[PDB]
Amino acid sequence: MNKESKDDDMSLGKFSFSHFLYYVYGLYKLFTGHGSDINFGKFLLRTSPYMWANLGIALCVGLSVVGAAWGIFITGSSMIGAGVRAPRITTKNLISIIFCEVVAIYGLIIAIVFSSKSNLYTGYSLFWAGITVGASNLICGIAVGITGATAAISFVKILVIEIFGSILGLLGLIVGLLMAGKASEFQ
Amino acid sequence: FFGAIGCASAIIFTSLGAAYGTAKSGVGICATCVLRPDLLFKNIVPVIMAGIIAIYGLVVSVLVCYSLGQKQALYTGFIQLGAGLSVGLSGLAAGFAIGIVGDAGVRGSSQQPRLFVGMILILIFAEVLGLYGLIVALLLNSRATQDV
Amino acid sequence: FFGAIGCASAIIFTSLGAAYGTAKSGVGICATCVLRPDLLFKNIVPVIMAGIIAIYGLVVSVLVCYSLGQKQALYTGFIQLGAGLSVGLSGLAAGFAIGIVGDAGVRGSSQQPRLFVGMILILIFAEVLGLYGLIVALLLNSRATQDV
Amino acid sequence: APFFGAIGCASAIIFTSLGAAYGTAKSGVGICATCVLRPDLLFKNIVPVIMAGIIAIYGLVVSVLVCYSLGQKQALYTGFIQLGAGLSVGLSGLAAGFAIGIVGDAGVRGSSQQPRLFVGMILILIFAEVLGLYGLIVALLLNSRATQDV
Amino acid sequence: APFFGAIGCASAIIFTSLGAAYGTAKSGVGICATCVLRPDLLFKNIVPVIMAGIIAIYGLVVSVLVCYSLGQKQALYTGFIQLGAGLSVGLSGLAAGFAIGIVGDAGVRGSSQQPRLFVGMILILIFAEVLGLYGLIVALLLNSRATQDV
Amino acid sequence: APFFGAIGCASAIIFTSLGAAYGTAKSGVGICATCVLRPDLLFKNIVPVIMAGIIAIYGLVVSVLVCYSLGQKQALYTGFIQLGAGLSVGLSGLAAGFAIGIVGDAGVRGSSQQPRLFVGMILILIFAEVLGLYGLIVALLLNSRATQDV
Amino acid sequence: PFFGAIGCASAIIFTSLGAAYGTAKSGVGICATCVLRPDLLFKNIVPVIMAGIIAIYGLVVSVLVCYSLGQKQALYTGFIQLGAGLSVGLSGLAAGFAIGIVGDAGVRGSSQQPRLFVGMILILIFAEVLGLYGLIVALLLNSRATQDV
Amino acid sequence: APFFGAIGCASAIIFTSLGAAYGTAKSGVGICATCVLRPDLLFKNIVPVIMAGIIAIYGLVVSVLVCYSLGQKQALYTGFIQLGAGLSVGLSGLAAGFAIGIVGDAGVRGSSQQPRLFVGMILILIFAEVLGLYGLIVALLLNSRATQDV
Amino acid sequence: APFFGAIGCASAIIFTSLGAAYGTAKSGVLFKNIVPVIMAGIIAIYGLVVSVLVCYSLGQKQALYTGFIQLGAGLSVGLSGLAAGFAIGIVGDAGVRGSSQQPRLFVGMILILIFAEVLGLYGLIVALLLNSRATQDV
Amino acid sequence: FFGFAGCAAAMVLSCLGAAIGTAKSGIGIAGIGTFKPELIMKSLIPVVMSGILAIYGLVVAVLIAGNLSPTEDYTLFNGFMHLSCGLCVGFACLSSGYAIGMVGDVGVRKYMHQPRLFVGIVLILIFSEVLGLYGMIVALILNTRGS
């Protein structure tokens, strides 16, 4: 029902805040105010189906995107930070920057393959795929980044770890495929 | 047919990033120019880079705008909602990246007028994030067809 | 026909930005003038730039205001809601940028009476964010037609 | 239904007050803080607050206008706009004050050092309030559309 | 059938109190803090608090008025305005105090240094309360519209 | 029917206590903190707390009164006012204490330095409690309107 | 339903918390002072022994309510019960929150000046009555568990 | 009917554990921290923890008792009390520990300096646990009233 | 007919695993100082048993009761488990740190945690009895 | 049906730890120096220990995918446990993770302090590792009973 239009507001109602973060009680009153709504209480009213679709696929890339843009983020200083001390061999440290982004390309891959009201399994089971590779990316951007920001100032003995954090991208992408593998096309 | 909030959502977040990108870029920019007045026209790169992301969401919004309609298919905007968030959040990430590196670049290029090219490169390497989201929504837009 | 909250929403946020823009701009402005009394008329640029964004939402609101009506089409305001948020949030970003750079500019131009043109440029480059949102809502407004 | 938007009629005087207050305060803090150094600037330094308080008058007008329009029955449409009305003025005011005070301290702090920039300090402030004016304009328009009334 | 807005009748005395309190405190802190240096300024420095407490009297009036109007039955319209009434006065007061106290410390702290600005410190404060007055005016008007009563 | 507002009957003694406590504490902290310097001021410095505790007595009265009025059945109207009653007194008290304690420390800290301002420190405190009195007055009135009872 | 019995817990619950919280910040200084003066121990025990008293209340409160619960009940019966606990409990929770604060002051002060102890007692003696009120409240409330539908 | 209150049967051992843990920790921290200075006080300094752990035993008893009473069917009344039971013991325990540990560090830290106050440090602790005892008593009584059972 | 409470099964090992995790965490940061970690894990060890036993009982069918029994039977372990770690963790740092100075008194620092890790034991005890009682339903 | 969420829940939770094993490890792996040394083996041990953490959830996700069907029986509701199944496995891997680095970041450094202690941290790490092993076991049991 109406609950449709809210979650979008809910989702958006969040990202703004987390954005303005980069620029507590309110939780509890929700919980108690919720904790009562259950008990009152005498009869139960329970979850049920809606259409969904996209919200995963777009959330997938986006959630993934930041993972990159948050990866080059922590490194982007660190390279330049090394920088003026020894500006050359910036690019020898560049190999780090490339991974930090490629984990975004994972999930652009998603964006396509996910091209496509009974047996909702197509749509419904579509979603959690989007989120899973997305967050798997999201942190996959972290790991490569933090190593990189160390890699910059810190040779290849590093890069073992950076790639030891690369495969998270793949495995991150693999299951998103599998989890989508059985999914028929909706109208 | 409420997903049109997406049509806003794109220009919304994308703006934020660009802003946020512009700021922490600009702060050092003016902060560096006092030491070296020359680097201004050079140090403008991040912001002019940064603002680009805005143009995306504009395109995104504009495209979605055409597609809204009093009636619609419930399917029509979801994708629309998906469209904006894609571009927008990506942008919001894009900016978050741009600005951070932005300060580093101008702060660095001050000290060593060499790494500037690198500072460009990383930035040149930053925006493609936005490009992806743009690509995403466009594809998503392309699928506004078949329309019930 | 409740989306008229949007018609407020525009002037609301847009104001906030302008305010927030004005403030952190002004703080340095008066803070710099004590050192150099001359730069006042120059240092007024950010605020006079900043306030511009307000004018947008005003236009936005004004336009939406015409369109409200006791009855309406549920479709009519959504776009209206979309309209304000678009301009407003964008503005809220716009200001959020303006002020930050605002202090830098006046603080910088104090030290080096050169970068001011750059400080202008970045600011000149800041507002277009607002312009976009304005453009967005206008388009959105334009689609208040077809009206059931 | 139940014509509840009158919370707006409060909402205007509410937030608008807050700003004015918040504006008054950080304005006043420096004002008294400066006067100890220069006792003369008092009558000059009163500008921000007297500027600041103006915004209050708006919401008062806003509320007053909405007040006339409430009624036991109403049209559900009637207050929404009313709600829109207050928020418009109020939030704008809340922004307006938040601007006024910040610049407020700067102005008096500055005018202390240089008894020149005072005119500028005025100008920026003179340039601040129009924010409130807009919201006022908004609600007024909104008020004007309380007509047609089902 | 709820006639529940009477929470407003409380809401006024509630927030209004808070402000007055909050006003009283940060006013008083400096007051006693200054008196140790100058014992004379006490009777002078009492101005903010005696100013501050005034706002309380408002909500009292507000509550009292609303109290008369409650009734076991009522019109759902009746309290909304009532709710509007309190919030108006109360929040305004809550702002009013928030202003009073801040300036309050400044005034007594300043008047300590320069026994001149006191008049200014009064003036700003004299200029502070009208915020509360507005809310009071608002609710009163709102109260006045408790008539027509279904 | 609910007749659940009796939570108010608690609500009064609840918050009112909190204030008194909170009032007592920050009052007491300095009290004992001052006595080490001057052992004499003890009996004097007891004023805030003995003042503070007074507010408690109110809610007690408030609760007690409401208690009489509860009943297994009731009118839904009956407690709302009851709820209104407590909140009124209680929150006001909660404000009252929050004032008392703050000034409380100042007074004893000040009276230590200057054994003059203590009368002022009393006065401000004497001027603090009336906040509570108001809430008390409010609920009492509210109580008085528990009549007509469906 | 007859669910208000959560109150019967609610009393001993919060009241405990206060007593605890009271005990702690009281005790911290107590042991902290004794190192300087070993004598004041038996004196410095006053706050805690004062503090713990509040616990006894809720116990009484709970105990009383406990008698009144019953498999069936009147929905009215526990509300008051809920009211009962909260009254005592929150009050206690306040009571403790007062006791401890003054508690440290008293022992810290009495260390320096072995005079103010009587005052430190007095304020504390003046603190608990808060709890007494809540106790009184619930008792009254309990007394009204009668008439019972 | 739900018979879901068995969450209580967990709730007791749950919180009670937490306290004991939390009690154990801040007790232990000083314990080992003191032993480095004086290796002897170990067997003495074990008192708080061995005291602390006692509270755990309670909830165990509490849970165990409730466990017997659960049943596939039940009376909705049956567990409420059960829920009441755990919370009573558990929260009390959670308080109990929160006390134990705090005093715990003080005691061992103090007894280090003065090997005298340890008896006092014991006494206060000896005086701490009775909090838990109460909750235990409460639930037991509550348990005792699981009878009459529809 | 939900049979939902099986979320309990996981819920046991979830906080459980966290316990030793944080437990071992503050433990590690020679041959003596492993003992806390050595003591630490058994909570996790306790965790598996619970989820295990619950699993076998769970079943595609059930009656909503035993689920509830299953539910929180883990919480008994898990909540305690997390606590147990929190106990261990603070301890796990202390005993080693002090032992640095004097390598004698660890006998207590081995005993304190020894009194500590029985916290978990209560959970299983609590837990087991629940499964011991999870039968007889209908 | 919705239990398919658990399929996600596996690595998004699993990888999470597995990352913070790697990163927290490597940040210490920078020092002390001497890039020559023949190990170059112990330096990876924490990572790969943390590495297979990611492997865990994968396996979990793998099994939970396959048993999951676009058009196969579920909704009465068969697959429901599978939700637990992944999340069951997950936090352990996570639980493992927060341990790994927490030992690792000091652990790698510890080699520079006492290379003769190199056996020791391992003994801690292996327990620090085993956490995931349990969950997985529990996980597989579930889907094993998953029908």
Coordinates of N, CA and C in Angstrom, one line a residue, chain F:
Chain F
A1 N -13.4 0.8 28.8 CA -12.8 2.1 28.6 C -11.5 2.1 29.3
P2 N -10.5 2.9 28.8 CA -9.2 2.9 29.4 C -9.0 3.4 30.8
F3 N -9.5 4.6 31.1 CA -9.1 5.3 32.4 C -7.7 5.1 32.7
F4 N -6.8 5.2 31.7 CA -5.4 4.9 31.8 C -4.6 6.1 32.3
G5 N -5.2 7.3 32.2 CA -4.4 8.5 32.5 C -3.7 8.5 33.9
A6 N -4.1 7.5 34.7 CA -3.5 7.4 36.0 C -2.0 7.4 36.0
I7 N -1.4 7.0 34.9 CA 0.0 7.2 34.7 C 0.4 8.6 35.0
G8 N -0.5 9.6 34.7 CA -0.2 10.9 35.2 C -0.1 11.0 36.7
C9 N -1.0 10.4 37.4 CA -0.9 10.4 38.9 C 0.5 10.0 39.3
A10 N 1.1 9.1 38.7 CA 2.5 8.8 38.9 C 3.3 9.9 38.3
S11 N 3.0 10.4 37.1 CA 3.9 11.3 36.3 C 4.3 12.5 37.2
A12 N 3.4 12.9 38.0 CA 3.7 14.1 38.8 C 4.8 13.8 39.8
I13 N 4.6 12.9 40.8 CA 5.6 12.6 41.7 C 6.9 12.1 41.0
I14 N 6.8 11.7 39.8 CA 7.9 11.1 39.1 C 8.9 12.3 38.8
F15 N 8.5 13.1 37.8 CA 9.3 14.1 37.3 C 9.7 15.1 38.5
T16 N 8.7 15.5 39.2 CA 8.9 16.4 40.3 C 10.0 15.9 41.2
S17 N 10.0 14.6 41.5 CA 11.1 14.1 42.3 C 12.4 14.3 41.5
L18 N 12.5 14.0 40.3 CA 13.7 14.1 39.5 C 14.3 15.5 39.7
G19 N 13.5 16.5 39.5 CA 14.0 17.9 39.7 C 14.5 18.1 41.0
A20 N 13.7 17.8 42.0 CA 14.1 18.0 43.4 C 15.5 17.3 43.6
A21 N 15.6 16.0 43.2 CA 16.8 15.4 43.2 C 17.9 16.2 42.5
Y22 N 17.7 16.4 41.2 CA 18.7 17.1 40.5 C 18.9 18.5 41.1
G23 N 17.9 19.1 41.6 CA 18.1 20.3 42.3 C 19.0 20.1 43.6
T24 N 18.6 19.1 44.4 CA 19.3 18.8 45.6 C 20.8 18.6 45.3
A25 N 21.1 17.8 44.3 CA 22.5 17.4 44.0 C 23.4 18.6 43.8
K26 N 23.2 19.3 42.6 CA 24.1 20.4 42.3 C 24.0 21.5 43.3
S27 N 23.0 21.6 44.1 CA 23.0 22.4 45.3 C 23.9 21.8 46.3
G28 N 23.8 20.6 46.7 CA 24.5 20.0 47.7 C 26.0 20.0 47.4
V29 N 26.4 19.7 46.2 CA 27.8 19.5 45.8 C 28.6 20.7 46.3
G30 N 28.2 21.9 45.9 CA 28.9 23.1 46.4 C 28.7 23.2 47.9
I31 N 27.5 22.9 48.5 CA 27.3 23.1 49.9 C 28.4 22.4 50.7
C32 N 28.5 21.1 50.6 CA 29.6 20.4 51.2 C 31.0 20.9 50.7
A33 N 31.0 21.3 49.4 CA 32.3 21.9 48.9 C 32.7 23.2 49.6
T34 N 31.7 24.0 49.9 CA 32.0 25.2 50.6 C 32.3 25.1 52.1
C35 N 31.5 24.2 52.7 CA 31.6 24.0 54.2 C 33.1 23.8 54.6
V36 N 33.8 23.1 53.8 CA 35.2 22.8 54.2 C 36.0 24.1 54.4
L37 N 35.7 25.1 53.5 CA 36.3 26.4 53.7 C 35.7 27.1 54.9
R38 N 34.3 27.3 54.9 CA 33.7 27.9 56.0 C 32.7 26.9 56.6
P39 N 32.9 26.4 57.8 CA 32.0 25.5 58.4 C 30.7 26.2 58.9
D40 N 30.7 27.5 59.0 CA 29.5 28.2 59.5 C 28.3 28.1 58.6
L41 N 28.6 28.4 57.3 CA 27.6 28.7 56.3 C 26.6 27.5 56.1
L42 N 26.9 26.3 56.7 CA 26.1 25.1 56.6 C 24.6 25.5 56.7
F43 N 24.2 25.9 58.0 CA 22.8 26.2 58.2 C 22.2 27.2 57.3
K44 N 23.1 28.1 56.8 CA 22.6 29.1 55.8 C 22.5 28.3 54.5
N45 N 23.6 27.6 54.1 CA 23.6 27.0 52.8 C 22.6 25.9 52.6
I46 N 21.8 25.5 53.7 CA 20.8 24.6 53.5 C 19.6 25.2 52.8
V47 N 19.5 26.5 52.6 CA 18.3 27.1 52.0 C 18.0 26.5 50.7
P48 N 18.9 26.3 49.7 CA 18.4 25.8 48.4 C 17.8 24.5 48.5
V49 N 18.4 23.5 49.2 CA 17.8 22.2 49.2 C 16.5 22.2 49.9
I50 N 16.4 22.9 51.0 CA 15.1 23.0 51.7 C 14.1 23.7 50.8
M51 N 14.6 24.7 50.1 CA 13.8 25.3 49.0 C 13.5 24.2 48.0
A52 N 14.5 23.5 47.5 CA 14.3 22.6 46.4 C 13.3 21.5 46.8
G53 N 13.4 20.9 47.9 CA 12.6 19.8 48.3 C 11.1 20.2 48.3
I54 N 10.8 21.5 48.4 CA 9.4 21.9 48.5 C 8.7 21.4 47.2
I55 N 9.3 21.5 46.1 CA 8.7 21.2 44.8 C 8.1 19.8 44.9
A56 N 8.9 18.9 45.5 CA 8.4 17.5 45.7 C 7.0 17.5 46.3
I57 N 6.9 18.3 47.4 CA 5.6 18.3 48.1 C 4.5 18.5 47.2
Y58 N 4.7 19.4 46.2 CA 3.6 19.7 45.3 C 3.1 18.4 44.6
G59 N 4.0 17.8 43.8 CA 3.6 16.6 43.1 C 2.9 15.6 44.0
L60 N 3.4 15.4 45.2 CA 2.7 14.6 46.2 C 1.3 15.0 46.3
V61 N 1.1 16.3 46.6 CA -0.3 16.8 46.7 C -1.0 16.5 45.4
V62 N -0.3 16.8 44.2 CA -0.9 16.5 42.9 C -1.4 15.1 42.8
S63 N -0.4 14.2 43.0 CA -0.7 12.8 43.0 C -1.9 12.4 43.9
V64 N -1.7 12.8 45.2 CA -2.7 12.5 46.2 C -4.1 12.9 45.7
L65 N -4.2 14.1 45.2 CA -5.5 14.6 44.7 C -6.0 13.7 43.6
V66 N -5.2 13.5 42.6 CA -5.6 12.7 41.4 C -5.9 11.3 41.9
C67 N -5.1 10.7 42.9 CA -5.4 9.4 43.4 C -6.8 9.2 43.8
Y68 N -7.4 10.2 44.5 CA -8.8 10.1 44.9 C -9.7 9.9 43.8
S69 N -9.3 10.5 42.6 CA -10.2 10.6 41.5 C -10.2 9.5 40.5
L70 N -9.4 8.4 40.8 CA -9.2 7.5 39.7 C -10.4 6.6 39.4
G71 N -10.6 5.6 40.2 CA -11.7 4.8 40.1 C -11.6 3.7 39.1
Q72 N -12.2 2.5 39.3 CA -12.1 1.4 38.3 C -12.7 1.8 37.0
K73 N -14.0 2.1 37.0 CA -14.5 2.9 35.9 C -14.1 4.3 36.0
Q74 N -14.4 5.1 35.0 CA -14.1 6.5 35.0 C -14.7 7.1 33.7
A75 N -14.5 8.3 33.5 CA -14.8 8.9 32.2 C -13.5 9.1 31.5
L76 N -13.5 8.7 30.2 CA -12.3 9.0 29.4 C -11.8 10.4 29.6
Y77 N -12.7 11.3 29.6 CA -12.3 12.7 29.9 C -11.6 12.8 31.2
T78 N -12.0 12.0 32.2 CA -11.6 12.3 33.6 C -10.1 12.3 33.7
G79 N -9.4 11.2 33.6 CA -8.0 11.3 33.2 C -8.1 11.7 31.8
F80 N -7.7 12.9 31.5 CA -6.9 13.3 30.4 C -6.2 14.4 31.2
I81 N -7.1 15.2 31.8 CA -6.9 16.3 32.7 C -5.9 15.7 33.7
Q82 N -6.2 14.5 34.3 CA -5.3 13.9 35.2 C -3.9 13.8 34.6
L83 N -3.8 13.3 33.4 CA -2.5 13.3 32.7 C -2.0 14.7 32.5
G84 N -2.9 15.6 32.1 CA -2.5 17.0 32.0 C -2.0 17.4 33.4
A85 N -2.7 17.0 34.4 CA -2.3 17.5 35.8 C -0.9 17.2 36.1
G86 N -0.5 15.9 36.0 CA 0.8 15.6 36.4 C 1.9 16.3 35.6
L87 N 1.8 16.1 34.3 CA 2.8 16.7 33.4 C 3.0 18.2 33.7
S88 N 1.9 18.9 33.9 CA 1.9 20.3 34.3 C 2.9 20.4 35.5
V89 N 2.4 19.9 36.6 CA 3.3 20.0 37.8 C 4.6 19.4 37.6
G90 N 4.7 18.2 37.1 CA 5.9 17.5 37.0 C 6.9 18.2 36.1
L91 N 6.6 18.4 34.9 CA 7.6 19.1 34.0 C 8.0 20.4 34.6
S92 N 7.0 21.2 35.0 CA 7.3 22.4 35.7 C 8.3 22.2 36.8
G93 N 8.0 21.3 37.7 CA 9.0 20.9 38.7 C 10.3 20.6 38.1
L94 N 10.3 19.7 37.1 CA 11.6 19.3 36.5 C 12.3 20.5 36.0
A95 N 11.6 21.5 35.5 CA 12.2 22.7 35.2 C 12.7 23.4 36.5
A96 N 11.7 23.4 37.5 CA 12.0 24.2 38.7 C 13.3 23.7 39.3
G97 N 13.5 22.4 39.5 CA 14.7 21.9 40.0 C 15.9 22.3 39.2
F98 N 15.8 22.1 37.8 CA 16.9 22.4 37.0 C 17.3 23.8 37.1
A99 N 16.4 24.7 37.5 CA 16.8 26.0 37.9 C 17.4 26.0 39.3
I100 N 16.8 25.4 40.2 CA 17.2 25.5 41.6 C 18.6 25.2 41.8
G101 N 19.0 24.0 41.3 CA 20.3 23.5 41.5 C 21.4 24.4 40.9
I102 N 21.2 24.8 39.7 CA 22.2 25.7 39.0 C 22.4 26.9 39.9
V103 N 21.4 27.7 40.1 CA 21.5 28.8 41.0 C 22.0 28.3 42.4
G104 N 21.6 27.1 42.8 CA 22.0 26.6 44.0 C 23.5 26.7 44.2
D105 N 24.3 26.1 43.3 CA 25.7 26.1 43.4 C 26.2 27.5 43.4
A106 N 25.8 28.4 42.5 CA 26.2 29.8 42.5 C 26.0 30.4 43.9
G107 N 24.9 30.3 44.5 CA 24.6 30.9 45.7 C 25.6 30.5 46.8
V108 N 25.8 29.2 47.0 CA 26.7 28.8 48.1 C 28.1 29.2 47.7
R109 N 28.5 29.0 46.4 CA 29.8 29.4 46.0 C 30.0 30.9 46.2
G110 N 29.0 31.7 45.8 CA 29.1 33.1 46.0 C 29.1 33.5 47.5
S111 N 28.1 33.1 48.2 CA 28.0 33.4 49.6 C 29.3 33.1 50.4
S112 N 30.0 32.0 49.9 CA 31.4 31.8 50.4 C 32.2 33.0 50.3
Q113 N 32.5 33.4 49.1 CA 33.3 34.6 48.8 C 32.8 35.8 49.6
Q114 N 31.6 36.2 49.2 CA 31.0 37.4 49.8 C 29.8 37.0 50.6
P115 N 29.9 37.1 52.0 CA 28.7 36.8 52.8 C 27.8 38.0 52.8
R116 N 27.4 38.4 51.6 CA 26.5 39.5 51.4 C 25.4 39.0 50.4
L117 N 25.8 38.6 49.2 CA 24.9 38.2 48.2 C 23.9 37.1 48.6
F118 N 24.2 36.5 49.7 CA 23.3 35.4 50.1 C 21.8 35.8 50.1
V119 N 21.5 37.0 50.5 CA 20.1 37.5 50.4 C 19.7 37.5 49.0
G120 N 20.6 38.0 48.1 CA 20.2 37.9 46.7 C 20.1 36.4 46.2
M121 N 21.1 35.6 46.5 CA 21.0 34.2 46.2 C 19.7 33.6 46.7
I122 N 19.3 34.1 47.9 CA 18.0 33.6 48.4 C 16.9 34.2 47.4
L123 N 17.0 35.5 47.1 CA 15.9 36.1 46.4 C 15.7 35.4 45.0
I124 N 16.8 35.2 44.3 CA 16.6 34.5 43.0 C 16.0 33.2 43.2
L125 N 16.5 32.4 44.2 CA 15.8 31.2 44.5 C 14.4 31.4 44.9
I126 N 14.2 32.3 45.8 CA 12.8 32.7 46.2 C 12.0 33.0 45.0
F127 N 12.7 33.5 44.0 CA 12.0 33.8 42.7 C 12.0 32.6 41.8
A128 N 12.7 31.5 42.1 CA 12.7 30.3 41.2 C 11.4 29.5 41.4
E129 N 11.0 29.2 42.6 CA 10.0 28.2 42.9 C 8.7 28.5 42.3
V130 N 8.3 29.7 42.2 CA 7.0 30.1 41.7 C 6.7 29.4 40.4
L131 N 7.7 29.0 39.7 CA 7.5 28.2 38.5 C 6.7 26.9 38.9
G132 N 7.2 26.2 39.9 CA 6.4 25.1 40.4 C 5.1 25.4 40.8
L133 N 4.9 26.5 41.6 CA 3.6 27.0 42.1 C 2.7 27.0 40.9
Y134 N 3.1 27.6 39.8 CA 2.2 27.7 38.6 C 1.7 26.3 38.2
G135 N 2.6 25.4 37.9 CA 2.1 24.1 37.6 C 1.1 23.5 38.6
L136 N 1.5 23.6 39.9 CA 0.6 23.2 40.9 C -0.8 23.9 40.7
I137 N -0.8 25.2 40.6 CA -2.0 25.9 40.3 C -2.7 25.3 39.1
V138 N -1.9 25.1 38.1 CA -2.5 24.5 36.8 C -3.3 23.3 37.1
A139 N -2.6 22.3 37.7 CA -3.2 21.0 37.9 C -4.4 21.1 38.8
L140 N -4.3 21.9 39.9 CA -5.4 22.1 40.8 C -6.6 22.5 40.0
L141 N -6.5 23.6 39.2 CA -7.5 24.0 38.3 C -8.0 22.8 37.5
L142 N -7.1 22.1 36.9 CA -7.4 21.0 36.1 C -8.2 20.0 37.0
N143 N -7.6 19.7 38.1 CA -8.4 18.8 39.1 C -9.8 19.3 39.3
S144 N -9.9 20.6 39.6 CA -11.2 21.2 39.8 C -12.2 20.9 38.7
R145 N -11.6 20.7 37.5 CA -12.5 20.4 36.3 C -12.7 18.9 36.1
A146 N -12.2 18.0 37.0 CA -12.6 16.6 36.9 C -14.1 16.5 37.1
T147 N -14.8 17.5 37.6 CA -16.2 17.5 37.8 C -16.9 17.5 36.4
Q148 N -18.3 17.4 36.5 CA -19.2 17.4 35.4 C -19.1 16.1 34.6
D149 N -18.0 15.4 34.7 CA -18.0 13.9 34.7 C -19.0 13.3 33.8
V150 N -18.9 13.4 32.5 CA -19.9 12.8 31.6 C -21.3 13.4 31.9

